[PDB]
Amino acid sequence: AASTIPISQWPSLLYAPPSSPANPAVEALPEMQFDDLHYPRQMLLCRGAGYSLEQCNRMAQPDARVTPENPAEKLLKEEAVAAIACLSQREGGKDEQCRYYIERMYKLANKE
Amino acid sequence: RLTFFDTESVALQSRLRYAEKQKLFHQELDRELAAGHIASLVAEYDPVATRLPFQPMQDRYRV
Amino acid sequence: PFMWRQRAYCAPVPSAFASQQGVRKPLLRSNSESLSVFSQIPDGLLGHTTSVTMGNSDIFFLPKPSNLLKIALPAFVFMPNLTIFTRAFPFYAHTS
Amino acid sequence: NAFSSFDACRTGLLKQQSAAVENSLVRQNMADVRAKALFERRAVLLDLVEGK
């Protein structure tokens, strides 16, 4: 059923992957970013402005141009906190002990 | 025929001039890319290695 | 213009790294010129090669000896008769 | 707004070039001094060497 993906189809595989029990956001895969040039560029700009290494290191800040945050963390806050409480109390939800909260979250997120 | 019954010559001349423009564009573009490829080596170029031991560096090699 | 050591097709030829050679030939050339036909070769006789024509060779001759034959032969019908029942032809053409 | 970033990156590149030249000169000179000292050490050890 799962047939081989040739090498020519890998660029399409990266941005339209097959279905899994744990899929990513295919619509947001073009939005995942992490700049390895952020701090070097910052340092170059500051040293061109005229600062010393200590001043540059004090002014350095981490990149804001990274992958956006999951909106579920702000929308389903209380539900997620309750689920985490249930997991911490019931040993990770063994034998279906956090099914209540997990099903409420799933329904809220999916809507049939 | 050529005096009264031909448009192919004119059409082909126009198309060949178009082809010439296209050819020279592609030529210049390829040349530009190769020049950029060579320009990528200026970072590797080290003019201090031309210095001889216990000798001064020459401005000939773009200090 | 981004990955020079990994994109060799867009790179200069090894004669360009050599620093030694009216009008001279150009010093810098790419391998991407290999993707063009008339880069190095000339465009001479470009549009005049489809005009060199040659005629066919078939001869339509066959003796027709009917003295050998004394019987008729079958013949195909090639098209429908429109000189008769012209008005009804779209209406009866599908029958048999 | 664009000229500011351009001038900054520009001066950064210039400083990089200057620092690279200086550091390469220093490294070269250190290596040459070390090599000379090794050569003299070899010379004295060849004056001390023994055999035929």
| CA–CA dist C9, B31 (Å, integer) | 12
Count of beta carbons in the 10 Å neighbourhood of residue D35: 10
Structural contact between residues B32 and C5, judged by C-beta atoms closer than 8 angstroms: no
Q: Least CB-CB distance to B37: which of C10, C26, C47? A: C10
The answer to whether the Cβ–Cβ distance between C47 and B35 falls below 8 Å is no
Total residues found in chain B within this entry: 63
Q: Least CB-CB distance to C28: which of B12, B23, B35? A: B35
> Which of C94, D15, B44 shows the shortest CA–CA distance to A45?
D15
- Using a CB-CB cut-off of 8 Å, the residues of chain A touching D11 are 48
Residue corresponding to tokens 């950029």: B36
Structural contact between residues B33 and C30, judged by C-beta atoms closer than 8 angstroms: yes
Terminal CA-CA length for chain C: 72
Backbone interruptions in chain C following residues (C to N > 2.5 Å): 21
Resolution (A): 4.8
Size of interface B-D (CB pairs under 8 A): 17
Q: What are phi and psi of C30, to 5 degrees?
A: -100, 165
**Exposure string over C35-48, b if 16+ CB within 10 A, otherwise e:** eeeeeeeeeeeeee
Q: How far is B30 from chain D (nearest CA, A)?
A: 27
| CA–CA dist A109, A75 (Å, integer) | 10
- Using a CB-CB cut-off of 8 Å, the residues of chain D touching A47 are 12, 15
The nearest alpha carbon in chain D to B56 belongs to D25
| CA–CA dist A53, B24 (Å, integer) | 49
Alpha-carbon dihedral sign for residues A42, A46, A52, A58: negative
Residue type, C76: F
What is the largest distance, in Å, between two alpha-carbon atoms of chain D?
A: 78
Q: Residue D45 to residues A22, D32, D49, D50, D51: CA-CA distances in angstroms? A: 71, 20, 6, 10, 13
The nearest alpha carbon in chain C to B8 belongs to C47
| Chain A contact for D32 (CB, 8 A cutoff) | no
Strand partners, C30: C12
| Chain D contact for A47 (CB, 8 A cutoff) | yes
| CA–CA dist B33, C2 (Å, integer) | 10
Q: How far is B16 from chain D (nearest CA, A)?
A: 43
Structural contact between residues A105 and A79, judged by C-beta atoms closer than 8 angstroms: yes
| CA–CA dist A73, A83 (Å, integer) | 13
Structural contact between residues D28 and B51, judged by C-beta atoms closer than 8 angstroms: yes
Please list, in sequence order, all residues whose beta carbon lies within 8 angstroms of the beta carbon of residue C27, skipping any fewer than 6 positions away.
Answer: C16, C21
